[PDB]
Write a protein that binds this ligand. Structure first.
Ligand SMILES: *[C@@H]1O[C@H](CO)[C@@H](O)[C@H](O)[C@H]1NC(C)=O
Lengths: 53, 170
């Protein structure tokens, strides 16, 4: 049990090229998406345990 | 050093000198007087600050994150990453230590060099009007006062005027 549940939901991802088509076929047990995401530009990403300034 | 002027035949330096780096110290009839030489000082200084300018600046090249501190990565790729980073870190440590060691060697030998260049400048101003001490002094033979000395330290010294006396006093 994890948070009192024994189920799991695991996530997969792929980058669809512009002017491409993704196609799902499914029989069940599928956690469907509602919104594709797009990247805005450039950024940095860090891991820390101190405050911003 | 390589030139044997600083810590060579010049026994030591002058803690009292705070005007520049290298200088003159004379003891004539009108008492002792000492003051610094600006051209050599500004030469050595401009060179050492040239080294600093070449060193003190940073690359624009940006590195991303390839691992994770909170949630460790897969074991094999993590050991390859740590192996690569350790090898690079080793390389940069070697490059740094070698760089600093050689920049210090060269710096020291360069100040030594500028000293030898000043001594050999004056030695050629006083063509036959002086004799080589051996401890970086110039035994003049004619009666050089506190104004003829200031004509040395401006290189305005004419050796032909005072040649007769110093020659005869050989
Ligand atoms: C992608 O391009 C091809 C040919 O260039 C076209 O047949 C297809 O319909 C395009 N896809 C979209 C989503 O417009």
């Amino acid at each position: 049990q994890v948070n009192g549940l024994s189920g799991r939901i695991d996530f997969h991802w792929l980058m669809l090229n512009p002017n491409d088509t993704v196609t799902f076929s499914f029989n069940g047990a599928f956690i469907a998406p509602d919104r594709a995401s797009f990247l805005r530009g450039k950024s940095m990403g860090i891991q820390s345990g101190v405050q911003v300034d | 050093g390589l030139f044997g002027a600083i810590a060579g035949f010049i026994e030591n330096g002058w803690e009292g000198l705070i005007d520049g780096w290298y200088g003159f110290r004379h003891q004539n009839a009108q008492g002792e007087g000492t003051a610094a030489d600006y051209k050599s000082t500004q030469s050595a200084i401009d060179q050492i600050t040239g080294k600093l300018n070449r060193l003190i600046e940073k690359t624009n090249q940006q590195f991303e994150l390839i691992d994770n501190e909170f949630n460790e990565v897969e074991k094999q790729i993590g050991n390859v990453i740590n192996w690569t980073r350790d090898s690079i870190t080793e390389v940069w440590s070697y490059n740094a230590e070698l760089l600093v060691a050689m920049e210090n060697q060269h710096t020291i030998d360069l100040a030594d060099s500028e000293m030898d260049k000043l001594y050999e400048r004056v030695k050629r101003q006083l063509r036959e009007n002086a004799e080589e001490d051996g401890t970086g002094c110039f035994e003049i033979f004619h009666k050089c006062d506190d104004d003829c000395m200031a004509s040395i330290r401006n290189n305005t010294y004419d050796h032909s005027k005072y040649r007769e006396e110093a020659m005869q006093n050989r």
